[PDB]
Design a protein around this nucleic acid. Structure first.
Lengths: 50, 50, 161
RNA sequence: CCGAGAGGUA
DNA sequence: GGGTATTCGCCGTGTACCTCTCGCAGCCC
DNA sequence: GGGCTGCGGTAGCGTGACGGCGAATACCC
């Protein structure tokens, strides 16, 4: 086998749209907003803090 | 492998891998050249979808 | 008015640009003159620094987005969702003066580098640029298993590593 | 020597 | 605040064989 | 001549399956 180094990471679509989404009910997060994050029309916070 | 002629009976997987590699190479060149925000967003979006 | 982004077909930015200049739509594409081997000839072509991307400024009331989308040579607006994207005015302003660094040239050989040969009786031989003759052909220090040679060849029979 | 489309036998 | 109740989009829909044609167009690099 | 690339166009094409099922959400509290 071989490989391809992706310059940006990529959500595996089986784990995104298996219905129920494993990423979806893993993050406690609805699938619609996760696809709005992944397809680059929304931002989601990481370590909001103060 | 070719069918009987001068042309290759191409496979769909090589189309998919060729699409992924072309988009990833374009994305490496744009991250090198410091393209603006929306251009590299579209580039990572097309890479995600490919 | 506002600014939108159009991804075009591959190698039709000039044709789509001509159609949008025949229309009343102000285009923007950062052109840099890159030294590119076209067909054996090192021709400096004022090609886009970006790929098929292009910027337009219009208003949807004057000429509609469907009409811009149906322009000869245009693939699609960049959307991210339903509506086409709005680039802010800072991006248009900072892509007015740009393109600083080099004549960077992906996959065209610069002299003083290492290449490979693609045809002929020397196919498969790594070579050093000593001195290309100009913008027409090149001259190469070819390797052998005994002694290196040199040759003045066109730019189709060899390609960069 | 893989896919699509059309027809047929059981 | 959750308890239905409607909508939505995913799954699935026989076996074996035989024959035939057709399988990139455009294009501006 | 040929490397590439996905509707050809200054829009619109799609339209004659059907069931089940489970999640996502609408309405009404």
């Amino acid at each position: 086998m071989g490989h391809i180094e992706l310059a940006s990471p990529t959500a595996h679509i089986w784990f995104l749209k298996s219905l129920p989404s494993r990423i979806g009910l893993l993050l406690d997060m609805p699938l619609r907003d996760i696809e709005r994050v992944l397809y680059f029309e929304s931002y989601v916070v990481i370590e909001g803090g103060m | 492998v070719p069918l009987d002629g001068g042309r290759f009976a191409t496979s769909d997987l090589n189309d998919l891998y060729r699409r992924v590699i072309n988009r990833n190479n374009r994305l490496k060149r744009l991250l090198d050249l410091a393209a603006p925000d929306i251009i590299v967003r579209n580039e990572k979006r097309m890479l995600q979808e490919a | 008015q506002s600014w939108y982004l159009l991804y075009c077909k591959r190698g039709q930015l000039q044709r789509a640009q001509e159609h949008l200049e025949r229309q009343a739509v102000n285009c923007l594409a950062p052109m840099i003159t890159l030294e590119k081997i076209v067909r054996g000839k090192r021709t400096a072509v004022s090609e886009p620094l970006f790929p098929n991307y292009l910027f337009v400024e219009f208003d949807p009331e004057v000429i509609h987005t469907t009409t811009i989308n149906a322009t000869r040579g245009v693939s699609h607006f960049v959307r991210f969702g339903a509506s086409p994207a709005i680039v802010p005015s800072a991006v248009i302003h900072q892509l007015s003066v740009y393109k600083p660094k080099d004549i960077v040239d992906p996959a065209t050989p610069y002299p003083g580098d290492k290449v490979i040969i693609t045809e002929g009786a020397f196919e498969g031989f790594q070579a050093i640029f000593t001195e290309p003759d100009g913008e027409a052909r090149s001259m190469l220090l070819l390797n052998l298993i005994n002694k290196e040679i040199k040759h003045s060849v066109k730019n189709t029979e060899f390609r960069k590593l």
